[PDB]
Ligand binder design. Structure first.
Ligand SMILES: *[C@@H]1O[C@H](CO)[C@@H](O[C@@H]2O[C@H](CO)[C@@H](O[C@@H]3O[C@H](CO[C@H]4O[C@H](CO)[C@@H](O)[C@H](O[C@H]5O[C@H](CO)[C@@H](O)[C@H](O)[C@@H]5O[C@H]5O[C@H](CO)[C@@H](O)[C@H](O)[C@@H]5O)[C@@H]4O)[C@@H](O)[C@H](O)[C@@H]3O)[C@H](O)[C@H]2NC(C)=O)[C@H](O)[C@H]1NC(C)=O
Ligand SMILES: CC(C)[C@H](C)[C@@H](O)[C@H](O)[C@@H](C)[C@H]1CC[C@H]2[C@@H]3COC(=O)[C@H]4C[C@H](O)[C@H](O)C[C@]4(C)[C@H]3CC[C@]12C
Ligand SMILES: *[C@@H]1O[C@H](CO)[C@@H](O[C@@H]2O[C@H](CO)[C@@H](O)[C@H](O)[C@H]2NC(C)=O)[C@H](O)[C@H]1NC(C)=O
Ligand SMILES: *[C@@H]1O[C@H](CO)[C@@H](O[C@@H]2O[C@H](CO)[C@@H](O)[C@H](O)[C@H]2NC(C)=O)[C@H](O)[C@H]1NC(C)=O
Ligand SMILES: *[C@@H]1O[C@H](CO)[C@@H](O[C@@H]2O[C@H](CO)[C@@H](O)[C@H](O)[C@H]2NC(C)=O)[C@H](O)[C@H]1NC(C)=O
Ligand SMILES: *[C@@H]1O[C@H](CO)[C@@H](O)[C@H](O)[C@H]1NC(C)=O
Ligand SMILES: *[C@@H]1O[C@H](CO)[C@@H](O)[C@H](O)[C@H]1NC(C)=O
Length: 724
């Protein structure tokens, strides 16, 4: 062990606790320049060490490597290194340093880098565990272009002079996703001659005012302060006047208020991306923004904006690709001028005050239709769905949910070749679902039509919808049998057919749907027996692609009148307040409304979560296999003709919160096994032929007497004791 070689051997024996891949297997005494990751300069001294993405675990002490006299390049990123260089130490020759994507927590290490390493061009410490507060700036490092401290735990405030004390050479500074706090207005930027990238996004910065010296950075290309606590208004006057190159601006998701200042339009000579989303802004996008000819992506969503600016302003920017205006106060008709934007890929008008017709001109001169998504949900739109929409061959998503729409759905929409999501719920739509579905048009992921006037049958053709994830037809006029072909949909997760006229028997082929976690058949005309095959995926179910979708679930204190009211709905682009215009809301006031992204309740080997067949004519016995569903939280079989006994197997319903067997023909004893269900919070066994002792264990003695009423001689607490 001699000199540099000794140093590296020290690292392998000391810094590295495990090398499962044997990447260091050739670091072995007797010349170190042939070692894996080691690169040498002509003197034969190590000029670099590249261990990236090697699966190494250990305690990094940076000074232990940087003692290497000639080392200019160090890549340890994408490993398990923790702790870090810390200490203080020898001379540092580093030019490039990448420590990202490790476990490093010791800010002392960054202090060492900012102090000693005077030839440093770039430092990436991002995606680590660094805790503590920012120290002195690296004023002595005069080649330093690039510093990425993002995705750490850094806290307290950015020191007032921190940024102004950086060397003149600084191009890129990223503080994104830390714990930083304090007044944004207290930062000084100094001369700021080279800085083209600055991001504070996802922190705790606050205050009433923008920093006076930020406008010093005349060359800033992207300025991102999004997802902070900034309050007050967007600075007007000359504040934006000196930015020469500003391309990406994001003020999004802050507390900012007032109108959007006309002076902001000074940025229009450059701006290609503007995100003002998620603030309190009112008024209009100023007319000066017609100069915004290079603007590609405009996000004004989630404010109080109103007026005609989409017409007078945004119509005029011919190259706009993405337009997000949802959750605002805009009224009037959707401007038809909007259809002059021939590069528009996404148009989100959801949750505004729009009246009048859906735009019929969206792909005219073609050349050729580029539009992917049109979202107008939760407005006041009237008339029908224009057949012209059938012209945009590129449509991936149409969302017209919760408008005043009427008439049938033109065949042309069902023949859109790329259609993925057709989401039209809470309208007055009529007609039928065509036999050509998913054959003569796109192979759909979701079809959400609940709470319309649709009639006829679910077409046997729905079986070719093999991409299908989520089907909601509830509360329509549908008749006929549930087609056995639905069993061909191996990704189907949620099927809601409730409150229709469906009849015949539930096809046993439903049990062949490998992904089904949610089945609501309630309030139909169904007869026949509960197929045993409905439980055949129990234990096998894998969490699928229905995750990550906006939903709402409306809970009510009812009750028998309240069935069919509330429950689970697709929530994209809709405000909770519009939910109160759903049917039966007077009888069934929402007691609680859950909302969010959909997430599965199991990592793997799951079952059905939710099964409601109540209010049908179903007969036969309960299949004992149903008791094998370990993740089932709702089983509602009430108001049917079901006979036989309650299966002892129901003891394996370990997740069940709601079990409604009421108003059937059940007989025999309640299974003592029911006492072992620890989450059972709602049990209704009433109006059957049941007899004998009410199990004494678990929750059974905690229920109101009404849950046991009208049976054949049940006894024991809460009823009269069995030893009468
Ligand atoms: C300023 O800095 C932030 C990072 O802190 C950058 O924001 C990130 O943008 C990326 C790229 O677009 C997003 O990743 C994509 O996310 C989508 C799904 O995203 C949804 O879910 C996440 C999770 O909660 C959410 O954060 C996203 O939020 C965006 O969209 C809102 C509008 O709906 C908007 O109000 C919000 O500001 C944010 O805006 C960005 O996206 C919209 C695109 O719709 C764009 O208009 C705008 O300019 C911003 O880019 C959203 O609800 C996945 O499908 C993708 O595959 C991909 O993962 C990040 O989610 C996003 N925000 C974060 C991380 O907080 C900005 O781009 C940056 N601006 C500039 C110019 O540098
Ligand atoms: C897996 C998805 C389909 C779903 C949207 C998912 O994201 C979501 O977390 C589901 C599981 C939740 C959201 C609301 C939940 C219900 C909340 O409201 C209901 O009143 C309760 C009553 C009672 O507490 C029961 O335990 C079940 C039950 C009825 C819950 C069962 C599971 C949910 C249905
Ligand atoms: C600093 O390194 C991080 C890597 O951890 C870089 O972030 C990655 O960038 C790539 C390519 O842009 C993304 O696709 C990766 O997903 C990112 N990974 C993570 C975990 O975010 C970052 O690019 C580097 N910073 C600089 C300035 O180069
Ligand atoms: C941006 O950084 C560069 C360094 O890359 C700075 O350039 C130095 O500027 C001085 C003064 O003009 C020159 O004498 C040096 O020769 C430059 N160094 C190099 C390596 O070119 C530049 O000043 C910085 N920008 C500003 C405006 O501060
Ligand atoms: C077909 O299905 C519906 C839904 O289950 C049945 O009826 C409803 O009947 C109950 C009891 O009378 C009422 O409380 C609901 O309000 C009714 N809803 C509607 C929209 O009608 C209906 O009886 C069945 N029809 C046949 C052929 O018997
Ligand atoms: C904008 O719409 C919201 C509905 O979410 C409403 O409360 C508000 O009054 C409207 N305009 C205002 C006053 O900001
Ligand atoms: C159930 O369906 C009938 C007929 O479609 C309708 O009048 C009613 O609004 C629906 N009820 C609920 C709770 O959605």
């Amino acid at each position: 062990d001699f000199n540099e070689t000794a140093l590296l051997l020290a690292f392998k024996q000391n810094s590295v606790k495990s090398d499962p891949n044997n990447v260091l297997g050739n670091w072995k005494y007797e010349g170190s320049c042939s070692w894996r990751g080691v690169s040498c300069s002509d003197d034969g001294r190590i000029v670099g060490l590249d261990l990236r993405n090697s699966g190494l675990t250990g305690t990094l002490n940076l000074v232990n490597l940087t003692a290497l006299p000639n080392l200019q390049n160090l890549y340890l990123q994408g490993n398990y290194f923790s702790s870090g260089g810390d200490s203080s130490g020898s001379d540092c020759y580093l030019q490039v340093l990448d420590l990202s994507s490790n476990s490093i927590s010791d800010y002392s290490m960054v202090d060492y880098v900012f102090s000693k390493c005077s030839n440093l061009v770039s430092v990436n410490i991002s995606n680590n565990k660094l805790v503590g507060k920012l120290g002195f700036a690296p004023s002595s490092l005069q080649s330093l272009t690039t510093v990425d401290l993002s995705y750490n735990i850094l806290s307290d405030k950015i020191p007032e002079s921190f940024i102004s004390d950086f060397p003149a050479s600084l191009k890129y500074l990223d503080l994104t996703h830390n714990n930083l706090s304090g007044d944004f207005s207290d930062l000084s930027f100094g001369i700021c001659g080279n800085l083209t990238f600055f991001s504070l996004s996802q922190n705790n910065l606050s205050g009433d005012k923008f920093p006076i010296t930020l406008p010093n950075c005349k060359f800033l290309e992207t300025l991102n302060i999004s997802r902070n606590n900034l309050a007050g208004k967007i600075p007007n006057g000359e504040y934006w006047g000196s930015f020469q190159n500003l391309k990406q601006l994001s003020l999004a998701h802050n507390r900012l208020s007032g109108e959007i200042p006309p002076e902001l339009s000074l940025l229009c000579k450059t701006l290609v991306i503007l995100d003002l989303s998620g603030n309190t802004f009112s008024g209009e996008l100023p007319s000066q923004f017609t100069a915004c000819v290079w603007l590609q992506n405009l996000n004004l969503g989630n404010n109080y904006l109103s007026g005609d600016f989409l017409n007078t302003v945004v119509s005029k920017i011919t190259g706009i690709t993405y337009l997000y205006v949802a959750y605002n106060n805009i009224s009037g008709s959707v401007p038809i001028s909007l259809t002059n934007c021939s590069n528009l890929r996404v148009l989100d008008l959801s949750s505004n005050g729009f009246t009048g017709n859906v735009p019929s001109g969206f792909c005219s001169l073609q050349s050729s239709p580029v539009l992917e998504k049109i979202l107008i949900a939760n407005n006041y739109l009237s008339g029908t769905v224009p057949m012209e929409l059938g012209k945009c061959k590129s449509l991936k998503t149409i969302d017209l949910s919760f408008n005043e729409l009427t008439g049938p759905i033109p065949k042309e929409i069902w023949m859109l070749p790329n259609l993925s999501d057709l989401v039209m719920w809470a309208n007055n739509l009529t007609g039928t679902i065509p036999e050509g579905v998913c054959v003569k048009g796109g192979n759909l992921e979701t079809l959400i039509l609940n709470n319309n006037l649709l009639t006829g049958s679910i077409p046997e053709s729905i079986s070719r919808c093999t991409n299908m994830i989520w089907i909601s037809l509830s509360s329509n006029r549908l008749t006929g049998k549930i087609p056995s072909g639905i069993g061909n949909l191996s990704k189907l997760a949620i099927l809601q057919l409730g409150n229709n006229s469906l009849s015949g028997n539930v096809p046993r082929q439903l049990g062949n749907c490998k992904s089904l976690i949610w089945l609501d058949l309630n309030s139909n005309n169904l007869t026949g027996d509960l197929p045993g095959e409905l439980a055949s995926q129990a234990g096998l179910v894998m969490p699928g692609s229905v995750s990550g979708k906006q939903f709402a679930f409306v809970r009510n204190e009812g009750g028998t009148d309240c069935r069919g009211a509330g429950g689970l709905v697709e929530f994209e682009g809709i405000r909770a307040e519009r939910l109160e215009r759903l049917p039966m809301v007077h009888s069934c006031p929402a007691t609680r409304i859950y909302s969010g992204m959909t997430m599965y309740t199991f990592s793997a080997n799951g079952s059905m979560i939710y099964f409601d067949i109540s209010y049908n004519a179903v007969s036969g016995f309960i299949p004992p296999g149903y008791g094998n569903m370990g993740y089932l939280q709702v089983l509602n079989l009430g108001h049917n003709r079901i006979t036989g006994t309650i299966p002892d197997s129901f003891g394996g319903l370990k997740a069940i919160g709601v079990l409604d067997l009421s108003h059937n023909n059940l007989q025999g004893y309640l299974p003592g096994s029911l006492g072992s269900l620890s989450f059972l919070s709602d049990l209704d066994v009433s109006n059957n032929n049941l007899t004998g002792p009410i199990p004494f264990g678990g929750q059974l003695t905690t229920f109101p007497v009404s849950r046991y009423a009208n049976n054949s001689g049940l006894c024991g607490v809460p009823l009269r004791p069995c030893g009468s």
